[PDB]
Structure formats: structure tokens, C-alpha cells
From Swiss-Prot, chain A:
It comes from the Eukaryota. One of its GO terms (molecular function) is RNA binding. One of its GO terms (biological process) is negative regulation of transcription elongation by RNA polymerase II. It comes from Homo sapiens. Its main location: nucleus. The chain holds residues 154 to 582 of 590 of the full protein. This is Negative elongation factor C/D.
From Swiss-Prot, chain B:
Belongs to the NELF-A family. Ubiquitous. Expressed in heart, brain, placenta, liver, skeletal muscle, kidney and pancreas. Expressed at lower level in adult lung. Expressed in fetal brain, lung, liver and kidney. Residues 125-187 are annotated as: NELF-C/D-binding. The chain holds residues 1 to 187 of 528 of the full protein. It comes from Homo sapiens (Human). Residues 89-187 form the HDAg domain. The NELF complex is composed of NELFA, NELFB, NELFCD (isoform NELF-C or isoform NELF-D) and NELFE; NELFA and NELFCD form a stable subcomplex that binds to the N-terminus of NELFB. In vitro, the NELFA:NELFCD subcomplex binds to ssDNA and ssRNA in a sequence- and structure-dependent manner. Interacts with the RNA polymerase II complex when it is not phosphorylated by P-TEFb. It is found in: Nucleus. The HDAg-like domain is essential for transcriptional repression, and mediates the interaction with the RNA polymerase II complex. It comes from the Eukaryota. Signal peptide: none annotated. Essential component of the NELF complex, a complex that negatively regulates the elongation of transcription by RNA polymerase II. The NELF complex, which acts via an association with the DSIF complex and causes transcriptional pausing, is counteracted by the P-TEFb kinase complex. This is Negative elongation factor A. The modification Phosphothreonine is found at residue 157. The gene is NELFA.
Length: 429, 187, 192, 149, 96, 85, 48
């Protein structure tokens, strides 16, 4: 506390000598770390470089679970200073030049640039200048303007459609920035968003080219372009967009075309767009008041999303967590209980398809937070142990033994019967 | 557009770009770069502090394409004059930005007697080589189809198989139930 | 003066072309009318097999009448709205309605979409004969067209039964005028 | 002079709600230097434009360089030099509303000038610094000219 | 059971704020409330107002002779004014 | 944001306009009211029997109205529970 | 009912609605022809 008082005094009276003398005494005594170093880290080159290197090495050691932990501090240190952000993005782009294992480096760069944008600092045009957009100045200017203003305009989209549909399309990887695609999904999926009908075909073609059209690159050289997923994919995108953005139509009509819905929901970009549309559509609190099914079709589509693609599992988990954490004070508790039971079924399905660890951790956190009814937890664990069979991995048993350790499960699920899931799991371990 | 002298230009630069709290170069730098100031930086660049150099160099890219087109030679001159500063930050930034006015892109050269860059590149490359199978798929891979993902980062690698299932989960039951309901409703 | 002299250049008219739909709105109107007829038939058959829960405060017949009238009014309103959407900015009925010079939305609805239900004394066409409005119907028919619902528009023309029903509906207006004038003149004289 | 505001705009979008009127088109434009938004109604029948066009927009108090501040009545027989000789589209109207992010304590950083050219509306939304010649209930000339660059 | 010349009673929920219960909240808002009301088919006004759980302040009678007999001459004047206003402004017209 | 001169002009205009709204002595308000009430009566056509007949029952005090009724308001907690009504 | 009893009726109302639309433009000749019918005009042609 007294060291903090010295820091405050030195800030308030920089001219005074004793404050500088105390700062240097603190540095010599070994307490230089407690001295302000968030901005000092940016002004130092080699120490910041070594911190970045160690943080990224730890990130790649521990997987995504450790990347989620190391990302905040590392991103704040990098993006607090613009020069540090520029140098960091430069080294990430240089490392990502290699086609072998460069996906992780590109993801790191995307996380850094997203964090920088979330702080009100715009450097998307810098990233475009980093890439091979020199041969296509029109595309670079268009994308820079679109990302700078953060909206979707018909003029730049028309320009991009004209050039990409032409005989010499620009690098597709340039338009594969997550921010642009997120804005595009906001435009064509979120209810209440209006788009030009006369350019909707161009929008769909741009999205299809960015998502489904594939290119071969060797030594950063364009070799061949596969455009097979361009007609059926674009038609599926159009049909799904029409279904999602026609909010006047009831959910019954959407279920009536379930065959086409399932046929189109089997593509990754389309499936993720469907989940996003459901996300905004149900994000309205009044949707549950207008939702008259205990086990609705939206959750079935969520199950289909979980089954279809493995990479979309974190998004399904986030949507389910958003739904479950939503505590409602405007509906009867019974419908809330039914919705939570159905969400438990959905997240059991997520667990079944291999997405076990985050679901189990979320259940453990909820049980230790007492935000879930004991009946809900009992039914969830009963169904989990009903569907699953031995053997079980070390991580699963390590995460699930404390789950049974809670009395709220031992005193409820344990029943007198030949097939007792809790007793069976205790005995087998 | 007055001719601002070297001491006066340095005072102006350290007043407009003197915000140490604003480590981010403000968008106003787009309007802070004119012909006269860039021309007169030829003499006041010696007295600028390193933070001022970094802020100005980072703001040099936030310019319109037409402005860069009409202000080429002065910007080449300022880049070559920045390439003679004590801070290697300015040297490297000017070296890469020398190609910005020509093609609109940034040069890519590293490991040129840059020990921090050398260590970072070497360790990150060797770590990626160690964990090439366990890569970090970017967000667009969540959007890319099968062929695009295989071409970019290889075919999808399934996670660890925790266990096996004896009873079909109720999600399949819900799927079948709602398929039957949709068949009944549509027909 | 100024507006009338500019109208010599702009001009204004109304004709047959302003009373025509796009042949796609006609399909929507026909489908809506068919759905309304099916719903009324379903209500009638459910009444015949005695599955109506009586309204808490009213007789069974009156709630049957309420169901029929609600269905018919909903159908008429939907058809009118669909007709209004179809009108272009060049339409003369729309121009004369939005300015408020003459006409109303229901006028365009009746001209284009459907005339609607005819009513006497606030109720549907009564059983003038024994349990049928006209000899052309069967006894105890509570269907839409039997009790005085006009399913055609003024452009498409009225069939003889609905023409006679419309005449019945229109007679009451003249009768009401002829009695109300003399009724209210005395009230006004007493007040003054 | 009397140049209240000058900049280069590019047509980022044409009327997004649809063609309410056939002869009049709505335009949403962005700036290049000052980065301010523009909404304008134009007579598309006589001065047709399409997406991606760029133009110089010079809002001026008077058409005469000497700034003699004409009354504002139509006198076609005037041989004095005018700015309209170097512009393709000229409109004359009055500014009728000035908005801003004004707080009860400190000033406003963003302004929004609304002008009506006898029915055709224009809103210029930008930072407060570039909008200082706009005072409500004053006459304004449009003076836009397309660019071939 | 019941009171004579009361043929039947309708249970009603006022969807218009005129017959709704309006009470000023603690922070100044008006916040019109919705409460059940009864619409009879006869006139007592004396054995009805004496009934328990029946509001003796907001209960009207729609009949001016009975209101004159029960409440007075100013009350009948106010009731007559309200009846005239209702019967004139039902169609949507307005009279000063 | 009115200025001082504008405020003085506003006060003067209000004081001038109010005096012109005073009722003129000698105005035959009875005949005017009779006409202004008889005019809408010529332009008007659960069951409460509004319109001209209701106006006739009100104007001619009659002890036998067609549809007399009361609007009974529940006093306390019974105004919410349906069965308690 | 403290409101006017006289308004604009029939085709004058329709023509004044069609005349004040955003897309109504007049040449000089028709402008002078219309201005000839103003009783209270001051004789000054407004700037277009």
C-alpha cells in the first residue's frame, strides 16, 4: 500500500527528487515489477519480444484451453502500444507465410487484430497492406473502407463481385477476415436487417466464393481454382437467407420445409449462419413468450448443427450457455424448467458427439454455483450415465468424480436398483 | 501551408504527437500529414523522440491513395531520412514502408541481424513444427467447407474419443420426432 | 386558382385500368376466400356434431354467429389489405384516397377485392322463407353465401342471389335516412 | 470567397428503401479526407448518377467570388463571373436544422446540418470542426461536379 | 339469491383506459391498471352500493332518474354531461 | 433560448391574444349551443342503444330506458381473482 | 368545435397533393403562367 502511495506521489509531483530516489531504490531492492510496467513494456523492445515469445510458446504448449487463459494479458500488452501491435502482427504474418502449420499463427494474428479493434484502434488497412493486395488495389481499398466504417455497402460489394467473378479473381484469403464475414452474417441473418434486393444475388455470390470456392497455393502461387460448391451452395444460401429473414412467416412454415432446411444446413458456412440467425432470433426475451413448444425445433436444429460439423461445437456451446444463463422473471417457472431440461438434452448431445470436456466443466461450474435446480442436475447426470458406456478417459473421470462427490447428486440419483449409474461409475473407477 | 522551420516543426510535432497516453496514432494524423510538414521534417527528425518517430511512421500509412500518389517523392525522402535514426524500430519500419508508395504493399524481410526477431521466429517455427498436428484453426476455418479446410490447414482432425455409447442419445429421438411432425404438417 | 391552373398540365382521371390487380393478388384473394369458406364449414359441422363450448354469458346460437362473423370479417380485412398492397403509385383510386378528396380504403377493397357481408338490422340476412333465405337454398343452411355474404367484387359482378341480398342491405340506408331526418328535426327544434 | 464547406465524396449507396419517387433519387455518400457522411436528394432524371461515382461537393454561401451577397431572386441576365461555370449540378436552398452531440456541460464534437433545396433534402453529418459556416435559416448553394479522375 | 330487476350480469375486462383503474405510483408515474368489472342489466344503485366488496365511489348507474333520486342534483348533472359526451363522441366527432 | 426583446414581445402577444378570446357580451350562447348539439345529431346513425335513440332518452327524461345498466367496480382483492368476482 | 368549416375539396385537394410531391419540377414558362394567378404576389421570381 505504501509503495502504491509512492507511485501516486511520483505521478503527482514528478519534479520532486525523493520520489525518483525512492523509485530507483525500489528498483534496486527488487520491487521494480510493482512499478508501472504496462506502458513500460511497450517502450521496451527486447523484453517485450521475449515476453511475447514465452507467452506464445506456452499457448501452443497447452492447447486452446491455455490459449484462452494467456490471450488476455498477451493481447493487452501487444495492443496497448501501436508500435508493439504493428511489430507483433508483422512477425505473425511472416511466420504464417509457411503453409505448414501456419493456421495457428494466422489464428493468433486474427485474435490480436480483433483485440486491437475491440479497443477502438483500427488497423485493418495495415493488415491488407501486409498481404498480397498490391496487385488488386481496388479490392484493398474496398475492404479497407468496409472494415473502417463497419457496415455493408452495395458499391464496394458490387466492385468485389465484378472483380472476383472476372477471369482474374484476387486472393480469396484476403476476404476471409472473420470481421467481414461476421458483418455479412449480421446483414443477411439477423432479423430486422434490411439489404438491397437488387444486389442480394451479388451478396450471395460473394459469400459463396469467400466460403466454398477453393484455391490451390504452392509457394504463395495461385495454381488452380475449384468452383464446384458454387451453384448448389449459392442456392442453399439464398433459400436459407429467405427462410431466416422472413420473420413474418411462422416457425411452423419453416418446419414444413424441414427437408430442404436439413439439406442446406449441411454446409459449414450455412450452418453457422443458421445458428447465428437463431442466436439473434431467440436473443429477444419475448421470443420464449412467442415460443409455444416445450422441446422446440430450434433446439433440434442446434442438435443438427452439433452433428454436422465439429468446428461449430464451441458456438453451439456458447449459444446453449447464453440460453441457460438467461434467468427469466416474466414467465412461469414450469416452462423455464422444461426449456432447461431440453437444453440439458441438447448439451448431452454435444457431450455425446465428442464435445465432452467443456460441457462437463460447465455442468460442474453450474452445480458448484447453485444456479441450476437439483432435479435438473439429477436428470442430466442420469441421462449422461444412461447413454455413455465404459471405458472412460482420464480427463472425463477426473472431471466427473467431483460431480458425483457433491451431495446434491449422491442423495438424489442413488436409488435401489440393479442398474445404479452412480454406483456403477464409482465401482468401475 | 506555411514553411514551419526545423525547431518550429519539432515543436509542432511534439505538441500534436506528444500524447504519450495516446500510444495509438489518432485518426487525425490523416489530416496531420501535408506537403510542407513532410518536406520540413528533413531537419527536425534529429530532435524527435523515439515515440514521436514511431507514431509518425505508424500514421504515415493512414493516408488516402490519391494523397500518396501525389506526394510520392517527399515520402520517399522522409523514408530514407528515417532510415538513419538511432532506433532500429524506425530503420525497420522505413525499410518495409519504402515499397508502400510504389505498390501499396509492405515489404517482408526478417532475421537480418535482428536478435529478437531471430529468436521469436526460430522458437515459434520450431514449436509449430512440434505441434503441427495440434494446430489452431482460425475462425474462417469454422466457415470454410471441407475442400477449403483440407487445402489450407489439412483435413479435419477429430478430437479425443472419450468413450463409446450404448444407448442412442435423445437428440436423434428429437430429430426423428420432428421429422415425423414436419411430414404430418406439410402433408 | 394556382392549383386548378396547374391541373390543366398535370391532369387527373379514373378508369377501368385503376380497378385491376396483377393477376397474382387475385390468386391470394381467392385462396383467402376459400380458406374462410372452409373455416366456416368446419365451424358449422362442429356445431352440427355438438362440440362448441358455449360462450360464458351467451347462447349457443349467438356464439355460433360470433364465430361466423369473426371469420368473415377477418377474411374481408385480409383480402382488402392484400388489394391495398397491390396498388401502384400511379393508381387513381389510391391518389384520390390518400389525399382525402374522396373515397376510403374500404371503397378500394370493395371495388377490387370483395364486397363483403351484407347486413340488415345489424344481423345477417334473415330466414324470410321457412328456414331459408331464398328458394335456391336448402333448409337450415348457415353457410356464408346462403346468409348474405358476397364473395365477388364490384368489378367481377354479383351473382343473382348476392345481388338481391345487396339490394336488401342497401334498402335499409334509404329507410334509415327517411326516418332519422324527421326524428332528429323534432329534437333540434325542441333544443332551440 | 464564401466557401462554407468543400470536400470529395463518392456514392457509397443509392436509395436503400427503394425508389419512392421516379425523378428524385436518394444518395448516401462518404467523404475522403474529413470522413463525414452525406445524404442527398438529387434530380436523377436530368443528372443521372450510379454507384461508385465520385464528385467534388462545394457548399458555398454565394456564387460570386467577390462575395457580393445577392438577394436571392432569379435574374438570368447576369454577366458577372460565377462558380456555376465550373460545376455541373447547382442547387439553391436553405439550412433548416442543426443537430449535434451537445451535452449540458461541454460542447459538441459532431454536427449534422440539414438543408432543404425546395423539397430535396440533404443531411451533412460530420465532426463539428468542418461545419462552422452553417447557421440555421440561411441560404446555401450546392455546387457539385462529377469527377472522372 | 340476488337483487330484483337484475336480469343478468356480464363479467368484463376493460381494454380501454377510460374504465381502467389509474393510480399514481410512488415515483409519479400513472401506470393504468386492469381490473375486473361487472355490467348489469338492471338498476338498483342502493342495494348494490351497500353490498360489500363493491366500490361505492366509482360505481355509476347510466340512468339519470335513479342517479337523481340516489345521489342528488349536481351528481345527476355530472352524469348527464358524461352520458351526452359519450353519446356524441362515440362516432369520433368532437363538440366543445 | 428567447432573448429579452423576444420575451417582451411574447408577453405582449399573449396579453393581446387572451383579451380577444373573452366572450362577447350579448352573444346568444343558448341558440349557438342548441345548433351545435343538433348538428351532430343529424350525422349519427354490449347492447347500450347509442345514437339518436340514446340522445332522445337523455333529452326526454324517461323512467323506462331501453337498456338501463350499472358499471360495478370491485373494491378490493376480489377485483383481481376471477372467482372472487 | 373550434376548427375550420372550410377546406380544400375535390380535385384541388388531389392536385395539391400531387403538386407538392418531392419529384414535381416546372420550367420557367409554366412557373410564370402559375404566378400570373397569384393575387398577393409581389412580382419577384424566386431563385429556382
Amino acid at each position: 500500500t505504501w509503495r502504491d502511495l509512492f507511485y501516486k506521489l511520483a505521478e503527482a509531483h514528478p519534479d520532486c527528487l525523493m520520489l525518483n530516489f525512492t523509485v530507483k531504490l525500489i528498483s534496486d531492492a527488487g520491487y521494480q515489477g510493482e512499478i508501472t510496467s504496462v506502458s513500460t513494456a511497450c517502450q521496451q523492445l527486447e523484453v517485450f519480444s521475449r515476453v511475447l515469445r514465452t507467452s506464445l510458446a506456452t499457448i501452443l504448449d497447452g492447447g486452446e484451453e491455455n490459449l484462452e487463459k494467456n490471450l488476455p494479458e498477451f493481447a493487452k500488452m501487444v495492443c496497448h502500444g501501436e508500435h508493439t501491435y504493428l511489430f507483433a502482427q508483422a512477425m505473425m504474418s511472416v511466420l504464417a507465410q509457411e503453409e505448414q502449420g501456419g493456421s495457428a499463427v494466422r489464428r493468433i494474428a486474427q485474435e490480436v487484430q480483433r483485440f486491437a479493434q475491440e479497443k477502438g484502434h483500427d488497423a485493418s488497412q495495415i493488415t491488407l497492406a501486409l498481404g498480397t493486395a498490391a496487385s488488386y488495389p481496388r479490392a484493398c481499398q474496398a475492404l479497407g473502407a468496409m472494415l473502417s466504417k463497419g457496415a455493408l455497402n452495395p458499391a464496394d460489394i458490387t466492385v468485389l463481385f465484378k472483380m472476383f467473378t472476372s477471369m482474374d479473381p484476387p486472393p480469396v484469403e484476403l476476404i476471409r477476415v472473420p470481421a467481414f464475414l461476421d458483418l455479412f452474417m449480421q446483414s443477411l441473418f439477423k432479423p430486422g436487417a434490411r439489404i438491397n434486393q437488387d444486389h442480394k444475388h451479388k451478396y450471395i455470390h460473394i459469400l459463396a466464393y469467400a466460403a466454398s470456392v477453393v484455391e490451390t497455393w504452392k509457394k504463395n502461387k495461385r495454381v488452380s481454382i475449384n468452383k464446384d460448391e458454387l451453384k448448389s451452395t449459392s442456392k442453399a444460401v439464398e433459400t436459407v437467407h429467405n427462410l431466416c429473414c422472413n420473420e413474418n412467416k411462422g416457425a411452423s412454415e419453416l418446419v414444413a420445409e424441414l427437408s430442404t432446411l436439413y439439406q442446406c444446413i449441411r454446409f459449414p458456412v450455412v450452418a453457422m449462419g443458421v445458428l447465428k440467425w437463431v442466436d439473434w432470433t431467440v436473443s429477444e426475451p419475448r421470443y420464449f413468450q412467442l415460443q409455444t413448444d416445450h422441446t422446440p425445433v430450434h433446439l433440434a436444429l442446434l442438435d443438427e448443427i452439433s452433428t454436422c460439423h465439429q468446428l461449430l461445437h464451441p458456438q453451439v456451446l456458447q449459444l446453449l450457455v447464453k440460453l441457460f444463463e438467461t434467468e427469466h422473471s416474466q414467465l412461469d417457472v414450469m416452462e423455464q424448467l422444461e426449456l432447461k431440461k431440453t437444453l440439458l438434452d441438447r448439451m448431452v448431445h454435444l457431450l455425446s458427439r465428442g464435445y465432452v470436456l467443456p460441457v462437463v466443466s460447465y455442468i460442474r461450474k453450474c452445480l458448484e454455483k447453485l444456479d441450476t435446480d437439483i432435479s435438473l442436475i439429477r436428470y442430466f447426470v442420469t441421462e449422461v450415465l444412461d447413454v455413455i458406456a465404459p471405458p472412460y478417459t482420464s480427463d472425463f473421470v477426473q472431471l466427473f468424480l467431483p460431480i458425483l462427490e457433491n451431495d446434491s447428486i449422491a442423495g438424489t440419483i442413488k436409488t435401489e436398483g440393479e442398474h445404479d449409474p452412480v454406483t456403477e461409475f464409482i465401482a468401475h473407477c | 501551408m506555411a514553411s514551419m522551420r526545423e525547431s518550429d516543426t519539432g515543436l509542432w510535432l511534439h505538441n500534436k504527437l506528444g500524447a504519450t497516453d495516446e500510444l495509438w496514432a489518432p485518426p487525425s494524423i490523416a489530416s496531420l500529414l501535408t506537403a510542407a510538414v513532410i518536406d520540413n521534417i528533413r531537419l527536425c527528425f534529429h530532435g524527435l523522440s523515439s515515440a514521436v518517430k514511431l507514431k509518425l511512421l505508424l500514421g504515415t500509412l493512414h493516408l488516402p491513395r490519391r494523397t500518396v500518389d501525389e506526394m510520392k517523392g517527399a515520402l520517399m525522402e522522409i523514408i530514407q531520412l528515417a532510415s538513419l535514426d538511432s532506433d532500429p524500430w524506425v530503420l525497420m519500419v522505413a525499410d518495409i514502408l519504402k515499397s508502400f508508395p510504389d505498390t501499396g504493399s509492405l515489404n517482408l524481410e526478417l532475421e537480418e541481424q535482428n536478435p529478437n526477431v531471430q529468436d521469436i521466429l526460430g522458437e515459434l517455427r520450431e514449436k509449430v513444427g512440434e505441434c503441427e498436428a495440434s494446430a489452431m484453426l482460425p475462425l474462417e476455418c469454422q466457415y470454410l467447407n471441407k475442400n477449403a479446410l483440407t487445402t489450407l490447414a489439412g483435413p479435419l482432425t477429430p478430437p479425443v474419443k472419450h468413450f463409446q455409447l450404448k444407448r442412442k442419445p435423445k437428440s436423434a429421438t428429437l430429430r426423428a420426432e420432428l421429422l415425423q411432425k414436419s411430414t404430418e404438417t406439410a402433408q | 386558382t394556382v392549383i386548378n391552373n396547374w391541373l390543366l398540365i398535370e391532369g387527373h382521371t379514373i378508369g377501368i385500368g385503376d380497378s385491376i390487380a396483377d393477376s397474382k393478388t387475385y390468386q391470394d384473394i381467392q385462396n383467402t376466400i376459400k380458406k374462410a369458406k372452409q373455416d366456416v364449414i368446419e365451424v358449422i359441422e362442429k356445431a352440427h356434431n355438438n362440440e362448441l363450448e358455449p360462450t360464458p354469458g351467451n347462447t349457443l346460437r349467438q356464439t355460433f354467429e360470433n364465430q361466423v362473423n369473426r371469420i368473415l370479417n377477418d377474411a374481408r380485412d385480409k383480402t382488402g389489405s392484400s388489394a391495398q398492397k397491390s396498388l401502384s403509385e400511379y393508381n387513381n383510386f389510391k391518389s384520390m384516397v390518400v389525399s382525402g378528396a374522396k373515397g376510403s380504403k374500404i371503397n378500394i377493397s370493395q371495388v377490387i377485392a370483395v364486397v363483403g357481408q351484407q347486413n340488415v338490422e345489424g344481423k345477417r340476412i334473415p330466414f324470410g322463407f321457412k328456414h331459408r333465405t331464398l328458394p335456391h337454398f336448402i333448409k337450415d343452411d348457415y353457410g356464408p353465401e346462403s346468409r348474405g355474404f358476397v364473395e365477388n367484387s364490384y368489378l367481377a359482378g354479383l351473382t343473382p342471389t348476392e345481388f338481391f341480398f345487396h339490394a336488401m342491405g342497401g334498402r335499409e340506408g334509404l329507410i334509415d335516412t327517411a326516418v332519422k331526418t324527421a326524428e332528429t328535426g323534432y329534437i333540434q327544434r325542441r333544443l332551440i | 470567397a464564401g466557401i462554407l464547406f468543400e470536400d470529395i465524396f463518392d456514392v457509397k449507396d443509392i436509395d436503400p428503401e427503394g425508389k419512392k419517387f421516379d425523378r428524385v433519387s436518394r444518395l448516401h455518400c462518404e467523404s475522403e479526407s474529413f470522413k463525414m457522411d452525406l445524404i442527398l436528394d438529387v434530380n436523377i432524371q436530368i443528372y443521372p448518377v450510379d454507384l461508385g461515382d465520385k464528385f467534388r461537393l462545394v457548399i458555398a454561401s454565394t456564387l460570386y467570388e467577390d462575395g457580393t451577397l445577392d438577394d436571392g431572386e432569379y435574374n438570368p441576365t447576369d454577366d458577372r463571373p460565377s462558380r456555376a461555370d465550373q460545376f455541373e449540378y447547382v442547387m439553391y436552398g436553405k439550412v433548416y436544422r442543426i443537430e449535434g452531440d451537445e451535452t449540458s456541460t461541454e460542447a459538441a464534437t459532431r454536427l449534422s446540418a440539414y438543408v432543404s433545396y425546395g423539397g430535396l433534402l440533404m443531411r451533412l453529418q460530420g465532426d463539428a470542426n468542418n461545419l462552422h459556416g452553417f447557421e440555421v435559416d440561411s441560404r446555401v448553394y450546392l455546387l457539385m461536379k462529377k469527377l472522372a479522375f | 339469491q340476488g337483487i330484483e330487476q337484475i336480469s343478468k350480469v356480464y363479467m368484463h375486462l376493460p381494454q380501454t383506459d377510460n374504465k381502467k383503474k389509474i393510480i399514481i405510483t410512488e415515483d409519479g408515474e400513472f401506470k393504468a391498471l386492469q381490473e375486473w368489472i361487472l355490467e348489469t342489466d338492471g338498476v338498483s344503485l342502493m342495494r348494490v352500493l351497500s353490498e360489500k366488496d363493491v366500490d361505492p365511489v366509482r360505481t355509476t348507474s347510466n340512468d339519470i332518474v335513479e342517479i337523481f333520486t340516489v345521489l342528488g342534483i349536481e351528481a345527476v348533472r355530472k352524469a348527464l354531461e358524461r352520458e351526452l359526451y359519450h353519446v356524441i363522441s362515440f362516432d369520433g366527432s368532437y363538440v366543445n | 433560448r428567447l432573448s429579452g426583446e423576444a420575451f417582451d414581445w411574447l408577453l405582449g402577444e399573449i396579453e393581446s391574444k387572451f383579451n380577444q378570446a373573452i366572450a362577447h357580451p350579448g352573444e346568444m350562447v343558448g341558440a349557438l349551443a342548441a345548433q351545435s348539439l343538433g348538428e351532430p345529431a343529424t350525422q349519427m346513425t354490449k347492447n347500450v342503444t347509442l345514437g339518436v335513440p340514446r340522445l332522445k332518452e337523455l333529452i326526454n327524461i324517461s323512467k323506462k330506458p331501453k337498456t338501463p345498466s350499472l358499471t360495478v367496480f370491485l373494491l378490493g382483492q376480489s377485483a383481481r381473482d376471477a372467482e372472487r368476482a | 368545435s373550434n376548427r375550420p368549416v372550410m377546406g380544400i375539396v375535390q380535385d384541388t385537394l388531389t392536385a395539391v397533393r400531387k403538386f407538392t410531391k418531392r419529384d414535381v419540377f416546372l420550367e420557367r414558362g409554366e412557373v410564370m403562367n402559375l404566378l400570373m394567378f397569384l393575387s398577393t404576389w409581389d412580382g419577384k421570381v424566386p431563385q429556382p
